[PDB]
Design a protein around this ligand. Structure first.
Ligand SMILES: CC(=O)N[C@H]1[C@H](Oc2ccc([N+](=O)[O-])cc2)O[C@H](CO)[C@@H](O[C@@H]2O[C@@H](C)[C@@H](O)[C@@H](O)[C@@H]2O)[C@@H]1O[C@@H]1O[C@H](CO)[C@H](O)[C@H](O)[C@H]1O[C@@H]1O[C@@H](C)[C@@H](O)[C@@H](O)[C@@H]1O
Ligand SMILES: CC(=O)N[C@H]1[C@H](Oc2ccc([N+](=O)[O-])cc2)O[C@H](CO)[C@@H](O[C@@H]2O[C@@H](C)[C@@H](O)[C@@H](O)[C@@H]2O)[C@@H]1O[C@@H]1O[C@H](CO)[C@H](O)[C@H](O)[C@H]1O[C@@H]1O[C@@H](C)[C@@H](O)[C@@H](O)[C@@H]1O
Ligand code: NA
Ligand code: NA
Lengths: 311, 302
């Protein structure tokens, strides 16, 4: 319809501190730049074009995000993946089932239970561990491998990663949540991976939204999980499907108390934000978390942003 | 601002009492069922009620301080901000699962270590003297012999209440937020069956744990969480007694049934006799706002 092809672009009118991470369900706790200015990312969750096209394993909503489901035989180590709703995972079509975790460079410590409940007594929760850099980690091929033999009844199991730790191998290496796992095998490449996102350069830098995930690391600091977009942005775009009318959407991060612009950002159609750091050490991490991103105008990709923060 | 609801199939939307996909749309098994959920409560102009969060990020989490050797979790908001006593039933997003024991998993935050499993199991009964979230605290079943600090987590699975012994889980109910001395202030109000041929519509998702029926623990809620987020963002003024919705098959554009969305944040339909109701409909439909109507507008039976 005319209305559909002329639908004005909008973003959710909610403060950032109230919005959610798109790599796991949690409130956003900060904005950061990547420690390495050359950091390329290839997250498989939290990937959506601003006209509402989902990429990688990204779900439309948080209901499906960061869950794992599959069948496992008693005495086996192999979880044969399905979609979160129990339907078959069409392998080679996607890197993994929709919402499957994309936490690379760490060990996963999962909690799962047999579904649906068919019991009248007892604790149904089971602890399993998954390494992501071993030959058995092949979600693209339809399966992942637990560390230990699964001595519990054969069936359909659902759950999630509860906490993460430093990868078992190579021994001594740290968690690196900037990376995704290898979804494929030594024999087969993972098909339909969401593409990499490169630093824009020319004064601009990628903006990441972070939330702490349980577990230790070599730095005795929170495991901050960076993502490109709040989940509510993704849901909004999927619902709205507003046509992209320019190279980038200029956003102002506005203080709700004073109505003053705290920082200029560009939201690119590929589904990521940039800013111009106001010198070394400056950046969006210096801004309060109660601001609201407001859509100002479609702009050229060459449009220059006022630098944000203080060096 | 014109009123709209999210253009996303129902099966892709989320429960507003815990983060999970909606797996069904039902009427209450008891036609006289009154509900008083504290989460998933939002006026359709974007006004949150009870303990309802704007988004799923805050939903169904518990945070507080606990001392090594104590049984008491002194609650904060999920972001660590102080919780004000006597003001609300509980912190924003605090679970509202009544008539069950809670089996929680929590961890000390932020991480300040390079070693170890940080996860702790604790259990909470909701009908005991120590369950007083309105006063800012809940009591664990066992003494907490783990380091003092700021803990965050959620309910992992539920079971039949410890007392009275033998009683079953009933997720149509909420816990007792209040104390012996005072009732909880600012509870979201009860929602009563509308009568006049109409019936309340509930969105259901399964939650882990046993029960006396050896069946799934089904969690009913009044609105998908995405509807709440939408209303909070849009803040569209209510301009009729009810918003008339069509539940549309997006594959064909066929109208599968008429519903009313009331200003108080709940949906009704008219069942076409017994056996009929929204549970007969496929879950891939999208609700579409059609018109503001008066409360006397008669719905076509579903
Ligand atoms: C405190 C506890 O663990 N209670 C268990 C109970 O434990 C014992 C029974 C007898 C002895 N003994 O001879 O000395 C020692 C320990 O065992 C029964 C039977 O297995 C458990 O009840 C059953 O499982 C529950 C999950 C419910 O489905 C219940 O209906 C079943 O009968 C009992 O577990 C507790 O049951 C309570 C209701 O009666 C209530 O549901 C409570 O939350 C349950 O405790 C939880 O589950 C336990 C298995 C355990 O994990 C505990 O830490 C949890 O809090
Ligand atoms: C298999 C295991 O449990 N590995 C543990 C290791 O356990 C033992 C140490 C010594 C004995 N013994 O003398 O007989 C027996 C078992 O203990 C070390 C600490 O000394 C653990 O490493 C530390 O904790 C981890 C969570 C990491 O933070 C790590 O950096 C710390 O040094 C070790 O845990 C495993 O470490 C691996 C990296 O080296 C990897 O992170 C792996 O996932 C860890 O295993 C998990 O955590 C354990 C504590 C345990 O809960 C296990 O079930 C988990 O899979
Ligand atoms: Na692999
Ligand atoms: Na109480």
């Amino acid at each position: 319809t005319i209305e559909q092809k002329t639908r004005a672009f909008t973003v959710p009118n909610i403060p950032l501190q109230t919005l959610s991470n798109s790599r796991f369900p949690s409130l956003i706790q900060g904005m950061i730049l990547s420690p390495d200015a050359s950091q390329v990312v290839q997250f498989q969750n939290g990937r959506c074009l601003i006209d509402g096209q989902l990429l990688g394993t990204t779900p439309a909503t948080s209901g499906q995000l960061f869950r794992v489901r599959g069948k496992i035989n008693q005495g086996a180590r192999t979880l044969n993946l399905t979609e979160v709703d129990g339907k078959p995972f069409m392998a080679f079509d996607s890197p993994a089932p929709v919402g499957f975790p994309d936490f690379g460079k760490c060990d996963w410590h999962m909690r799962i239970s047999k579904t649906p409940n068919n019991t009248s007594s007892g604790d149904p929760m089971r602890s399993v561990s998954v390494q992501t850099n071993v030959q058995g980690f092949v979600p693209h091929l339809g399966s992942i491998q637990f560390d230990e033999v699964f001595n519990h009844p054969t069936g359909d199991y659902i759950g999630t990663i509860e906490w993460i730790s430093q990868p078992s191998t190579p021994p001594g290496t740290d968690i690196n949540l900037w990376e995704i796992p290898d979804y494929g095998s030594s024999l087969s490449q993972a098909a339909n991976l969401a593409p990499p996102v490169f630093p824009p350069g020319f004064g601009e830098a990628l903006v990441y939204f972070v939330s702490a995930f349980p577990g230790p690391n070599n730095r005795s600091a929170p495991n901050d999980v960076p993502c490109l977009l709040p989940q509510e942005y993704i849901t909004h775009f999927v619902s709205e499907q507003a046509p992209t009318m320019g190279d980038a959407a200029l956003l102002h991060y506005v203080d709700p108390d004073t109505n003053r612009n705290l920082g200029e950002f560009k939201l690119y159609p590929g589904g990521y934000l940039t800013c111009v750091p106001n010198g070394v050490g400056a950046g969006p991490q210096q801004l309060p978390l109660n601001g609201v991103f407001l859509f100002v105008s479609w702009v050229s990709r060459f449009y220059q942003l006022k630098p944000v923060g203080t060096a």
